[PDB]
Design a protein around this ligand. Structure first.
Ligand SMILES: [Mg+2]
Ligand SMILES: [Mg+2]
Ligand SMILES: [Mg+2]
Ligand SMILES: [Mg+2]
Lengths: 371, 371
């Protein structure tokens, strides 16, 4: 996968506090759109102009991986999330630009094709009863054709406490009883448990035919997660908060998890996610990326899953409504997230195949850096 | 060390792009002053108001360590530097408040006492010739009585290359020749070398009686640094960019370095630095913190070194002039950094014993969050 030299002459951000989009312009005038990670995106865009753009402007992106490494090296006093959430916006915009120059969706540029991806209906909520959770999943199944469903266990980073006593013990048998025997059932504990409790819960998930046990232990304690993986046959999965490529190497080399789950934007973009996917590929681990919302993170993940040889079983697809993500409304000219028989679809449109809504841009905070 | 319960009712920041100070107010009316980490402090202060203040305001901070842990847990999607740089400003402000309430310097509250600390003259520069480096260190020695001196090796995160060919091979013998046989000589490679290159340099340092070899290898590659420590008799030191307590535990448990070097403000404040010092103490490793300018980070480190039982040999004391740090002129009413016979001194003044210059504050950007 090789690309002619290109120099960026401008990087622009259009943002609010929830989401920010990035437009890059090359010296020949070609332009591409991407997105920084959601959540405090306004801070991320400030970091982008302060600490990413100065190193990327007027440089050759023909080896984008090396350029991104150089950013991390020049900003080595800033290990962590914000720098990477910012890099992700420039990286994703460059992919859009390349796709538009080639007349190919990003998925094709990465060696795949346009086509469908199986989706799982992902609930973000713990303030929902097991009863109501099953009832809405039943409705979503009937309306859109999903055949895979993720719910929540424990309390978010809950130090071993449940959301309320008994919730987790109820939700597991409830989902299997209510969804029937063929539904794929996933759960995510969001760093709640010590290994002893996580293994207990693991046996229960196994008893009820769950096939995906996400983030059972504090994600920063790789030895805890490995102890759980080792004691259980159900797939133990993780990685969504991992933005450090050294930590990724350590997690994969020790096989802490059975399925790796990078977030394309938390990790710092497509290039860096492909590094992780190739580490996992060499380790014979599948890749099932995290996507928390219907900003572009989901679409980026769709393209990735249509390309990588070790794609996991399905796309994470948030089923929360407006009420949950009121900011995610009216981001795009055309909706890229129609679901048909439980599948999402990447089209043959060049680049990401999305346009940012001009009305949303009008209301945005604009900032530009020039070479 | 037990404290009476206290609730913060306001957190205020006063910042520019280079440094920002924090004033905290308790419900009884007492106030304390601290500082976020230098460099992009305006972004750090936004993170403070966005992501630290909401979790600390109106809460009991007597168990300050637990409240800080809670911040990192509520903000678990933001591992890394900015969150910790922000938390550090609140933590150091609370310590100043506690000192002022008790009428005691922070050093005393930590179990130590007012008194002197040996300082080393720390050069930040690689553009300087070894000749010119030796000559200014001699001037500084005669003027201030320093008997320890740190210079730079390699290029900063230089991927194994030198600043220019031969600079490092020249500077090592040049410092020992020119400074004479009794001076303590330290060097810092700022993540430049692969282990075999660092071991080769380590032999040259040993031949010339250097006593401290800092950050020989990329700081994020702990196994590389351990290889170097294991091959050399000279103390290998590091940790200034490490803000993750789990990484600290890993680094200390594997004995990757001989001396640990947290930066109090990068790490997230006094409480979290004491946690690192205690881990190091249990492993019989000394603590020689990083402090690379004459914002309050140097003073905070002076108080810490007056208290911890496993204090290292000396305070890092930047000897760069105003060419170098123009923003550091005119920050404080007092000058807490006079050096005499190569020692700095912590007085009995309550808290940190420093007032921010009223003119500086008048020119600063102000922001407030209230309970
Ligand atoms: Mg998850
Ligand atoms: Mg297993
Ligand atoms: Mg250093
Ligand atoms: Mg050794």
């Amino acid at each position: 996968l090789y690309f002619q030299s290109m120099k960026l002459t401008a990087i622009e951000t259009f943002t609010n506090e929830f989401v920010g989009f990035v437009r890059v312009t090359s010296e020949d005038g070609a332009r591409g759109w991407g997105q920084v990670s959601t959540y405090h995106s306004d801070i991320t865009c400030e970091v982008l102009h302060r600490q990413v753009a100065p190193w990327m402007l007027g440089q050759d992106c023909s080896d984008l991986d090396d350029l991104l490494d150089l950013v991390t090296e020049r900003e080595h006093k800033f290990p962590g999330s914000y720098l990477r959430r910012a890099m992700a916006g420039v990286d994703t915009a460059i992919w859009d630009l390349r796709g538009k120059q080639a007349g190919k969706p990003v998925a094709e540029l990465l060696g795949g094709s346009a086509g469908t991806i199986r989706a799982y209906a992902s609930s973000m909520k713990r303030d929902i009863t097991p009863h109501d959770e099953a009832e809405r999943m039943k409705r979503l199944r009937d309306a859109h054709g999903f055949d895979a469903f993720k719910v929540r266990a424990g309390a978010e980073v809950g130090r071993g406490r449940d959301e309320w006593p008994g919730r987790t013990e109820e939700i597991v048998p409830t989902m299997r009883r209510e969804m029937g025997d063929s539904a794929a059932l996933l759960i995510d504990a969001n760093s709640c448990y010590a290994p002893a409790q996580a293994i207990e819960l693991g046996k229960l998930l196994q008893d009820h035919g769950f096939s995906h046990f996400e983030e059972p232990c504090p994600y920063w304690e790789l030895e805890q997660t490995k102890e759980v993986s080792e004691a259980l046959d159900i797939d133990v999965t993780g990685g969504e908060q991992d933005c450090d490529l050294t930590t990724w190497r350590r997690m994969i080399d020790m096989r802490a998890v059975d399925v790796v789950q990078p977030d394309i934007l938390y990790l710092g973009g497509i290039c860096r996610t492909l590094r992780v996917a190739r580490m996992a590929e060499a380790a014979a681990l599948p890749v099932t990326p995290h996507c928390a919302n219907l900003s572009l993170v989901t679409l980026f993940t769709m393209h990735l899953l249509r390309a990588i040889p070790n794609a996991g079983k399905y796309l994470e697809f948030s089923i929360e409504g407006e009420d949950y993500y009121p900011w995610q409304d009216g981001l795009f000219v055309e909706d890229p997230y129609r679901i048909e028989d439980g599948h999402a679809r990447v089209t043959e449109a060049p680049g990401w195949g999305v346009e940012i809504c001009p009305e949303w841009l009008a209301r945005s905070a604009y900032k530009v850096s020039r070479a």
